[PDB]
Ligand binder design. Structure first.
Ligand SMILES: [Ca+2]
Ligand SMILES: [Zn+2]
Lengths: 132, 92
């Protein structure tokens, strides 16, 4: 429900190198890269799904992130679809990387706060929320 | 065809892999449904990784995916594709 209201992206991402989504299956997941956050900051989004689609589009425009995906995943992100996670990191019915709110939305974590958003594998998003 | 990968000719199975690779589903779930069916049909242990995380030493393309599946099924004594009409001769 709070994910269904519009908002504006704020905040700072983090430095990211050549193994960005290696982080996505551990701890709180991988950060929004700081140069991506720079490009989205203070833009208006109609809902979180809007932000999610525009986020993956922005990733597609960043050659140093784009190069971390093989061809079919590059096609997905250019179309604003999330990339597929590795088979070992998927859950039945949940095959793609997921955006997670480190401080959860239910705990008044900011929905479009880019310091708060993480990219996680489906297994790890579930395991974060059951305390693993 | 629909029950088994052996009900598809190789051309028809390639058109299916092409479709997944285009990622043009109107929603992600439409394409996810194709991927789950791909895993069911191929029976290949790597599943979706064949599509999205391919081995570096064959081609990253729908044709490369179809070749790696063909070879693995042959190697493992599984039934292969339906015979197509490619071998048929037209008179002149
Ligand atoms: Ca998501
Ligand atoms: Zn979460």
């Amino acid at each position: 429900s709070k994910r269904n209201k519009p908002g504006k992206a704020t905040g700072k991402g983090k430095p990211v190198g050549d193994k960005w989504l290696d982080d996505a299956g551990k701890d709180s997941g991988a950060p929004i890269p700081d140069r991506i956050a720079d490009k989205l900051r203070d833009k208006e989004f109609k809902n979180f799904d809007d932000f999610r689609k525009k986020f993956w589009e922005e990733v597609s425009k960043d050659p140093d992130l784009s190069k971390q995906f093989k061809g079919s995943n590059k096609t997905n992100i250019q179309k604003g679809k999330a990339p597929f996670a590795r088979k070992k990191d998927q859950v039945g019915g949940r095959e793609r990387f997921e955006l997670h709110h480190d401080k959860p939305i239910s705990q008044d974590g900011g929905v479009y706060d880019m310091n708060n958003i993480r990219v996680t594998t489906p297994k790890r998003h579930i395991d974060i929320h059951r305390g693993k | 065809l629909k029950h088994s990968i052996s009900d598809y000719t190789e051309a028809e199975f390639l058109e299916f892999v092409k479709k997944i690779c285009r990622a043009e589903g109107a929603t992600e779930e439409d394409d996810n449904k194709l991927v789950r069916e791909f895993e069911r049909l191929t029976e290949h242990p790597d599943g979706s990784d064949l599509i999205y995380y391919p081995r570096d030493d064959r081609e990253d393309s729908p044709e490369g995916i179809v070749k790696e599946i063909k070879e693995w099924r042959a190697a493992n004594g599984k039934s292969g594709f339906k015979q197509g009409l490619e071998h048929h001769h037209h008179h002149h």
